[PDB]
Write a protein that binds this ligand. Structure first.
Ligand SMILES: [Mg+2]
Ligand SMILES: [Mg+2]
Ligand SMILES: [Mg+2]
Length: 1258
DNA sequence: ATAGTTCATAGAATTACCTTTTAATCTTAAAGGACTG
DNA sequence: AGTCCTTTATCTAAAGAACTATGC
């Protein structure tokens, strides 16, 4: 009963962070509030955000200027380009080395250029914000003297002066920014990483540019007239203006030709965000206020011309936009709507609009309602001149048809063949041509099904009622406006306002719809002075006045939509520093005065004390010595981190180098770094080849120095024989493994009490619900990990290790405290499976109680498997174990279907189903829960409410919850049955399946069973590790640890015993084709003994080349068919008896029917016979559900899911999972025969799958 | 009867709101820089 | 010497109802 995974324990390390609540103890909270630390930290969090925004501005300016200045050699770009296109069609090593060379040369030029700048030197050091005496202060000051306002765009920072005060507010807090500076270093890093502007230029934007150039030349080749050069030279002249032509070095500013912008040297104009925006606008165009139609870009011209000549080939030439430059926060060249700030904007602007509509009067001094009703009544009457009023020939006309005639092309076809009874598309079509066209249309076609002009006119005559429909909603809207007219509330986007919001939208929607109905008449002012059409001038006068008034909808609709759908602003939590910028940076004893955070253990409870900055020596040696007592157990923490950095730093430092006294030999080894393979040499020195003797000499010097070190001796290092080391990193591993020690000092309760009472110490209990006195149940895994940190059994040989850089947070009360359930009153139980109908409690229950009050929080990082390195070649070790233990492994295959979120079959090595069940139901013996219904309801809620401007909440969390249950079920199955897990290779449902794969991988990184013993496999100290860390969905491939991924092909409709799958798919087309189809069968004969017909064939002989194999299918069994009279039960053998008797084909003696079948010439015969064959071939029969097989097995048995053995699929879903598991079986066999040193092949092909699945029982 | 299609479909842009995955840095004690005593 | 605040050291690795069509 021992798991085959028993040895897969303590395999590799990983980092985790545990989260707890901090409960202030004693007079701590009152002292905190007495010094105002919390509010100060809120202020500091906002000020910190602002400071990062200012520094970010400085970064942006620097990037812009330095990239403007950069000029890449045209020869470099040309070289890169030639190698880059040669790489297409050829993988030569010479080509990849040359490409690496060119790319790296360009990268080096840029990198060196920005590194040499004056402003880069001071970018990440303290001189930026707190000059010892700042470049930031200087730049801000110049920007003020130059009268240029940087912070105009954002609300939080008013002006430059405020930025000065904010920067100076961090006078002594530069270290507080170190992490941030790291992030900013990633912006300029010369390493190969996506966060670098060098990477963004060379890896991202250069290939995209060269691709756009290729597509452009090719576009001029295939479609020269596709793009209108004069037009883009006019519209985009602004974005086509460049200072320098890098091809000619000419420095004069002018608009460039598209030929010039795609000059390779002119790529030097697209480096920074300004050039990127220009280029991307040349591609995408822009909107301009005061222009009716948008200014077209290249891609628009390509699309339009491709649709003009009806050639989708041009699609391949659509150009890609350049990615943004990093950090750049820049304005768009296209028009940007203004924003409504709060609810008062919404209600007041809406009211203003609808009242402006109500009060407006035309030239004729009639209301818009009366005016439109008059115009459309006169139009219904035929009083107006139909030749002088026109519909826009665009989509609006189509929508008119579909609105009245239910078919969109009716009008367009009608005029189209009206002309027939080289015609280019007109912009407008007069109502005359319409009327005549659809009249002739009704004359040329069946009368009863026809479409009349009076229906159009009746639609336009019915339009005016929409105003009446709008009035009532307008007044109740007035009520809502009374509700929301408050100036700064901004709570209209709270979910609680849903109803209201919907109402608002409804109103707008109505009006919006109205506008579009009238849009068909409106004549946009797009300027073409060629032809002005003669029109009824009065009709269009009053109309265009009304429509111009109603067109104010679209800005209003956009502004309201953009405000309402915003994500609500919730304060969330902020970092508590307790006046210390290095608060939780490290737990080491020697760093206590600096980091001021200390851990205690009292009784079975844990505590975090934070020393007040003023008195940080509260716990120094003297104080622990004279306060030694039985109150609290203080943790003393010793760590030697980054040995590869720490040892040279300490031993070769200017301070102590004389003390450690390294020989000139060791100095040499260090200078040329001969002790390392790829280590960094000392600056100014040349890296020299690795020498094992130098390595071991350096290791000996390290041992001597450690034993000479005043402090580090205390670690009690036990080092391997230095001759055993083949590389310095094995020594460093032993150093870091043993350089971590946790011991405790006992401190009197009276001293702790006095030092908290004095406000010198801030004491918190580290708490989660498992530390309550009432908690009798299994604790959270994170509670077990936390406790394991300080456990003796862990301290003797450390697996759980405490990390520095913890953080503390404060979360304000988010929700008003509401007592949902008063005490002593019975509460209805939600689970219908619950034996207990209701429950009563002695105490109150408050919904979301934790959010009803302010709270303190502790995020503590830890390292698991501290003494193991990271995962390396994990799949190979898994596969070794599985090959060794192949006899015992089960296959747990998981499929997804319409009926189940996840369905699984457990199978053995022989193909027998041990277990088959659904993951829909999760529960104990007492209760159970079905998540399928709940998930369905979620998916409905999304799509429905999405059109209500209603907030969707926590659907992904609701899915991941369920999944978090099923990963536990799977883990249990896997350990219990020595199983590997097999998934199908891989819209929303699919995403749930993928999320299950990812969360299962992560679960199996570190697998602890709560009931297992602390020191035994599966327990806290010995956790199964059955997968490596998740990387990315693409990188899952075919195997992640004990999880494998197989193609899903042909797992649905296939016989479990014979592996038969229907590839015939016969359809009736003609008598000739039917005779040809039935002639190709080998033998169609009747079995007297068995009592059914038999069709024997070879898939080779039929149309599709892919199919193969000999088969004999039988008419045996029942079948189910659905039809519009419900479903009925058909017996194809009897049906065939009827058909053959009707045509006097004699099957009674068991003769062969093929020739007879092919001899008939009647359509009904072959139609019905092909139908019978089709129903026979139908394995999946669903009542309006079971699986059946037309192929007999060795025993002459036909598989029937309705009555089937335990080890066979009992339904179709289980059949799909079962075949997933059969592909898993193939994988197991390959794993079993895999040889050492040879790569394992996990790709399954349909041929291999069909051969295996057909021959396993045959 | 009955036997099949549609409730319009789709492309190229721009703006806005919302959402997601993915990829980087760190999860440190102690030397150094200044200054004070 | 004592302190506070900042900078430093640098390995390993590889659907369902309605409409359309007569094919029943
Ligand atoms: Mg430049
Ligand atoms: Mg529990
Ligand atoms: Mg809940």
């Amino acid at each position: 009963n021992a798991s085959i995974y028993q040895e897969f324990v303590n395999k590799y390390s990983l980092s985790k962070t545990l989260r707890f609540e901090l409960i202030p103890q004693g007079k701590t909270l009152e002292n905190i509030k007495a010094r105002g630390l919390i509010l100060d930290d809120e202020k500091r969090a906002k000020d910190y955000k602002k400071a990062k925004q200012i520094i970010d501005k400085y970064h942006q300016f620097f990037i812009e200027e330095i990239l403007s200045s950069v000029c890449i050699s045209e020869d470099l770009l040309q070289n890169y380009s030639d190698v880059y296109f040669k790489l297409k069609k050829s993988d030569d090593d010479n080509l990849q080395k040359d490409f690496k060379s060119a790319k790296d040369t360009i990268k080096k030029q840029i990198s060196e250029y920005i590194k040499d700048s004056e402003k880069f030197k001071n970018l990440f050091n303290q001189n930026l914000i707190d000059a010892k005496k700042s470049d930031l202060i200087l730049w801000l000051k110049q920007s003020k003297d130059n009268g240029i306002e940087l912070f105009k765009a954002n609300s939080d920072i008013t002006d430059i002066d405020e930025a000065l005060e904010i920067i100076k507010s961090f006078k002594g807090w530069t270290t507080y920014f170190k992490g941030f500076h790291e992030n900013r270093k990633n912006v300029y890093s010369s390493n190969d990483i996506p966060t670098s502007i060098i990477y963004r230029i060379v890896d991202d934007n250069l290939p995209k540019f060269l691709e756009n150039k290729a597509k452009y030349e090719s576009l001029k080749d295939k479609a020269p007239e596709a793009i209108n050069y004069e037009q883009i030279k006019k519209d985009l002249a602004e974005e086509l203006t460049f200072d320098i032509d890098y091809k000619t070095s000419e420095v004069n500013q002018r608009v460039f030709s598209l030929d010039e912008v795609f000059e390779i040297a002119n790529f030097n104009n697209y480096l920074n965000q300004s050039g990127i925006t220009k280029f991307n606008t040349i591609i995408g165009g822009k909107f301009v206020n005061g222009e009716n139609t948008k200014r077209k870009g290249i891609n628009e011209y390509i699309n339009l011309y491709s649709q003009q000549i009806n050639d989708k080939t041009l699609k391949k030439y659509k150009m890609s936009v350049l990615f943004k430059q990093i950090l750049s926060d820049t304005e768009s060249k296209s028009f940007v709507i203004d924003k409504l700030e709060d609810d008062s904007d919404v209600v007041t602007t809406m009211q203003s609009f609808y009242e402006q509509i109500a009060a407006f009067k035309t030239v004729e001094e009639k209301s818009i309602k009366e005016t439109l009703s008059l115009l459309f009544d006169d139009l219904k009457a035929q009083k107006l001149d139909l030749s002088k009023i026109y519909f826009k020939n665009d989509k609006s006309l189509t929508d008119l048809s579909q609105q009245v005639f239910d078919d969109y092309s009716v009008i367009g076809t009608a005029v189209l063949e009206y002309i027939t009874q080289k015609t280019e598309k007109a912009k407008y079509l007069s109502l005359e041509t319409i009327k005549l066209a659809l009249e002739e249309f009704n004359k040329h076609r069946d009368i009863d099904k026809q479409c009349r002009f009076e229906e159009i006119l009746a639609n336009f005559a019915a339009i005016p009622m929409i105003f009446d429909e709008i009035a009532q909603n307008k007044d109740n809207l007035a009520q809502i406006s009374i509700k929301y007219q408050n100036q700064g509330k901004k709570d209209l986007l709270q979910a609680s306002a849903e109803d209201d919001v919907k109402a608002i939208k409804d109103l707008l929607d109505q009006t919006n719809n109205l506008l579009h109905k009238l849009k068909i008449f409106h004549i946009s002012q797009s300027e073409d002075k060629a032809n002005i059409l003669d029109k009824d001038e009065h009709f269009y006068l009053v109309f265009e006045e009304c429509y111009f008034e109603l067109a104010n909808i679209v800005p209003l609709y956009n502004k309201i939509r953009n405000y309402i759908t915003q994500k609500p602003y919730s304060d969330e939590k902020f970092k508590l520093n307790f006046e210390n910028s290095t608060l939780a940076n490290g737990w080491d004893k020697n760093k206590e005065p600096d980091n001021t955070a200390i851990l205690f253990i009292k009784d079975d409870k844990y505590y975090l004390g934070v020393m007040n900055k003023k008195n940080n020596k509260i716990f120094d040696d003297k104080a622990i010595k004279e306060n030694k007592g039985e109150g609290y157990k203080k943790i003393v923490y010793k760590l030697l981190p980054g040995a590869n950095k720490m040892l040279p730093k300490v031993f070769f430092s200017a301070k102590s180098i004389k003390f450690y006294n390294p020989s000139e030999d060791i100095l040499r080894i260090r200078n040329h770094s001969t002790h390392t393979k790829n280590g960094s040499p000392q600056k100014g020195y040349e890296k020299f080849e690795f020498n094992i003797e130098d390595c071991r000499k350096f290791i000996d010097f390290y041992k001597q120095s450690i034993s000479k070190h005043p402090e580090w001796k205390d670690f009690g290092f036990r080092f391997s024989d230095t001759q055993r080391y083949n590389s310095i990193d094995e020594f460093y591993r032993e150093v870091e493994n043993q350089g971590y020690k946790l011991t405790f000092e006992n401190i009197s309760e009276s001293y702790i009490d006095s030092v908290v009472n004095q406000g010198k110490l801030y004491l918190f209990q580290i708490y989660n619900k498992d530390f309550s006195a009432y908690s009798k149940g299994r604790p959270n895994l994170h509670t077990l990990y936390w406790k394991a940190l300080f456990d003796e059994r862990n301290l003797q040989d450390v697996v759980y290790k405490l990390n520095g850089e913890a953080e503390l947070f404060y979360r304000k009360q988010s929700i008003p405290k509401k007592i949902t359930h008063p005490a002593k009153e019975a509460i209805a139980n939600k689970n219908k499976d619950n034996p207990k109908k209701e429950s009563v409690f002695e105490y109150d229950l408050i919904k979301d109680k934790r959010f009803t009050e302010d709270k303190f929080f502790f995020h503590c990082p830890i390292t698991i498997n501290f003494k193991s390195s990271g995962a390396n070649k994990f799949n190979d070790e898994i596969n070794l174990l599985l090959k060794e233990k192949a006899n015992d492994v089960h296959i747990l295959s998981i499929d997804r279907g319409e009926r189940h979120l996840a369905y699984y079959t457990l199978v053995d090595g022989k193909g027998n189903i041990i277990k088959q069940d659904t993951f829909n139901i999760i529960g104990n013996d007492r209760m159970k829960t079905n998540y399928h219904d709940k998930l369905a309801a979620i998916e409905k809620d999304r799509d429905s409410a999405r059109k209500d401007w209603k907030k969707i909440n926590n659907i992904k969390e609701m899915k991941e919850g369920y999944l978090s249950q099923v990963v536990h079920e799977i883990a249990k199955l896997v350990i219990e049955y020595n199983a590997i897990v097999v998934f199908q290779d891989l819209k929303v449902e699919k995403q749930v399946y993928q999320k299950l794969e990812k969360m299962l991988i992560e679960k199996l990184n570190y697998l602890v069973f709560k009931d297992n013993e602390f020191d035994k496999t599966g327990g806290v100290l010995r956790a199964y590790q059955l997968t490596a860390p998740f990387e990315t969905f693409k990188k899952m491939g075919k195997q992640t640890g004990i999880i494998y991924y197989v193609p899903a092909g042909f797992t649905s409709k296939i016989c479990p015993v014979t592996g038969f799958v229907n590839q015939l798919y016969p359809k009736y087309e003609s008598v000739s084709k039917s005779q040809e189809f039935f002639s190709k069968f080998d033998k169609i004969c009747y079995n007297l003994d068995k009592g059914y017909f038999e069709f024997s064939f070879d898939y080779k002989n039929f149309g599709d080349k892919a199919a193969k194999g000999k088969w004999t299918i039988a008419s045996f069994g029942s079948r189910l068919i659905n039809f519009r009279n419900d479903t009925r039960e058909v017996y194809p053998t009897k049906e065939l008896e009827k058909l053959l008797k009707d045509y006097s084909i004699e099957y009674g003696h068991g003769e062969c029917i093929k020739a007879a079948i092919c001899g008939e010439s009647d359509k009904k015969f072959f139609a019905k016979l092909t139908s019978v064959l089709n129903t026979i071939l139908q394995m999946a029969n669903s009542k309006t559900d079971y699986l059946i097989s037309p192929v007999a097995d060795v025993n002459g048995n036909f598989f029937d899911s309705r009555q089937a053995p335990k080890n066979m699929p009992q339904d179709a879903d289980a059949n799909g999972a079962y075949h997933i598991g059969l592909k898993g079986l193939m994988l197991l066999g390959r794993i079993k025969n895999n040889q050492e040193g040879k790569k394992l092949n996990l790709v399954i092909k349909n041929e291999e799958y069909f051969e295996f699945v057909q021959n396993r029982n045959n």
